């Protein structure tokens, strides 16, 4: 999605990227838990 | 845009006959509008107080213009002075009629009006408020 030219839906591409960042952060939180336990 | 009064008022049909003939042979737009109004239902024919008549006679050079209310002319105990100008209308509630006459007016009706002014010269057509009940 950060590649093509138009999306046909505040740009939603940046929103895609920030959503993925929240996802990998949830991964990191559930990994910090697992490595604490 | 209905083309006949849905009422079987004998007198309303007589007035519609008069105003069809006048609108057909005068070419003064006052007749076209007064006729088109004579076809209006009861929720589209709302009442005009005597207060709006006073507030309209307040205008410039509207001193001797008779006012014409196709609907009915109710009363308003919230004023304390009425001018002395002729008012013509369909129906006059007895309060308003007594007020107009006590100040000195004349509640001619629409056919005395037809005689007094066929083309409608020197007249104010007042329409009451409508968007109240919704």
């Amino acid at each position: 999605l950060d590649d093509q030219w138009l999306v046909e839906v505040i740009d939603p591409r940046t929103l895609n990227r920030a959503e993925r960042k929240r996802l990998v952060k949830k991964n990191e939180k559930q990994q910090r838990r697992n490595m604490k336990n | 845009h209905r083309t006949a009064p849905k009422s079987d008022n004998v007198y309303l049909k007589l007035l519609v006959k008069l105003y069809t003939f006048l609108a057909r042979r005068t070419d003064a737009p006052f007749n076209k509008v007064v006729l088109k109004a004579l076809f209006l239902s009861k929720i589209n024919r709302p009442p005009v107080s005597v207060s709006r008549i006073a507030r309209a006679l307040k205008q410039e050079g509207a001193a001797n213009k008779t006012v014409v209310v196709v609907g009915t002319v109710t009363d308003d105990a919230r004023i304390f002075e009425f001018p002395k100008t002729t008012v013509a209308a369909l129906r006059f509630t007895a309060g308003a009629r007594a007020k107009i006459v006590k100040a000195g007016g004349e509640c001619i009706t629409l056919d005395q009006l037809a005689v007094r002014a066929p083309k409608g010269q020197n007249t104010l057509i007042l329409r009451g408020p409508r968007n109240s009940r919704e």
Binding site: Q4, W5, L6, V7, E8, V9, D11, R13 | -
Partner: protein, 119 residues
């Protein structure tokens, strides 16, 4: 060259992602990350607004009203001149009228008869 909200734009490209690829719509948001455009898209018989973000590497500024500008100048100036010195105006555009007669003279253009031989 920078944008402002509401100027009729064009589009272009530098593949098979979403082919409008030629439409002229109005921009609505001059953002750094992208430019958003509205498109009049027909669904059955229904001109709808389609909102779409684009990257500014494939967008050019339409100039479709420059002709109207130039012709406003032409026509106003012409009718002013015509009010100055009074002759016929004909200050309206016309379709191509058909040509009239003329004599095509053969003194050096003698005709040459050819068929699909080729020769």
């Amino acid at each position: 060259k920078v944008y402002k909200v509401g100027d009729i734009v064009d589009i272009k490209a530098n593949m098979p992602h979403k082919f409008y690829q030629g439409k002229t719509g109005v921009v609505y948001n001059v953002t750094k990350s992208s430019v958003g455009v509205i498109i009049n898209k027909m669904v059955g018989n229904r001109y709808l607004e389609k909102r779409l973000n684009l990257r500014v590497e494939h967008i050019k500024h339409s100039k479709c009203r420059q002709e109207f500008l130039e012709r406003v100048k032409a026509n106003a100036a012409k009718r002013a001149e015509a009010k100055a010195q009074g002759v016929a105006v004909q200050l309206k555009r016309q379709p191509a009228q058909p040509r009239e007669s003329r004599i095509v003279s053969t003194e050096g253009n003698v005709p040459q008869t050819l068929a699909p031989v080729p020769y």
